[PDB]
Amino acid sequence: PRWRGFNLLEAFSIKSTGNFKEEDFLWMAQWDFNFVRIPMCHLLWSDRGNPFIIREDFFEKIDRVIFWGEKYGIHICISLHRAPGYSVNKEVEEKTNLWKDETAQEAFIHHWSFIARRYKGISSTHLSFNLINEPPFPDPQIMSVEDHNSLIKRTITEIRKIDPERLIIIDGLGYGNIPVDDLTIENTVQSCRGYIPFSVTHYKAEWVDSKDFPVPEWPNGWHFGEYWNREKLLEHYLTWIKLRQKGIEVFCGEMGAYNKTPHDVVLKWLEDLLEIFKTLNIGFALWNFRGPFGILDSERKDVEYEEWYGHKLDRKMLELLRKY
Incomplete structure (x- = not known):
C-alpha cells in the first residue's frame, strides 16, 4: 500500500538523544498514517576520526522503533542521513568523500552490514533501508553518476548476502530530485523530494x-532562479513515475515547508503537491511530525493551534495530509 507518513528526527543530529516517542506512532496510526522514515546520524554510534x-x-x-512500527502498523524506513564521508x-x-574514497566506502558497507545482520529476521513489510540521504548533483569531481551507482550496487550486494529479501530505498541524485536511470535493481524503490519551490x-x-529569496507566494513560487506552478510540479513528478516502466516504484521520502x-501560502502549495501525489499514486513523508516542518509543535505565528x-496541532495541515 502507498506509504503516507513522516520523518522522525530523534537520531538525526550529533546532539540527538536517540529516544523516539511511542506516542508519535500511536497518534499517526490513529490518524491512519502507515510510514515513518528515520534519518540517522552515524556519529551517534561511531567516530569522526x-x-x-x-x-x-x-x-x-532503534529496536524500540521497530517494535512500535509493528505494534502500530507503521512501516519503518531506516536511513543514513550522515554516513562516513557524506551528509x-x-x-x-x-x-572524507564517500563517493570517491575507498576507505569511507568500506566503512559505509561495514555499517550497513552491521545493520542488515541485526535486523535479518525483520520482514520488508515492516522494515526498509535507505542507504544514504540526498546525494548531490553528479559533478564527477565530487560524485559521478557511475561513482554513485557502483557504490549503491556494491552496498546492496553486501546487504543481500546477509538478508536476500531486504527492500532498499534509493534517493534520487541532485538532493533527491533526479531519478537514477541505470539503477534497476530488484526490490528497490527510488525516493524523490517535495521541497520545490524553495521560496x-x-x-x-x-x-x-x-537571504535573497522572494516573498513566498503560490502559485508562481521561486526555486533556484525558476518560477513554479502546479503544472510544472505535475510535469516534474511525471518524469519520476516513468521509472515504473522499468519496474521501479517511487515515493517522496521528504516534503514540506518551514515555519x-x-x-495560507503553505496550505495552497501543499494542497497542490498532495493532489499531484494522489493523482500519480506517489507516497509521501512530511519532513517532521513534531517540529518546524511538522503538523505538531511547528511554532508558526499565524496558526490557531x-x-x-x-x-x-496544526489541524488544517493534518486534515490536508489525511485526505490525500
Missing part, C-alpha cells in the same frame, strides 16, 4: 543560503 567504530548499544533504541547536514564537516518551503531557513512561510496532549 574513525568511521569503523560501532557502539552497538545505540541500536537498542547534507553541515553541523559536522566530513573529512515557499525554505523561506528564511538558516541552513540554506536563503516562517505564511500559513489545537491542544494535543501537551502539544500544539
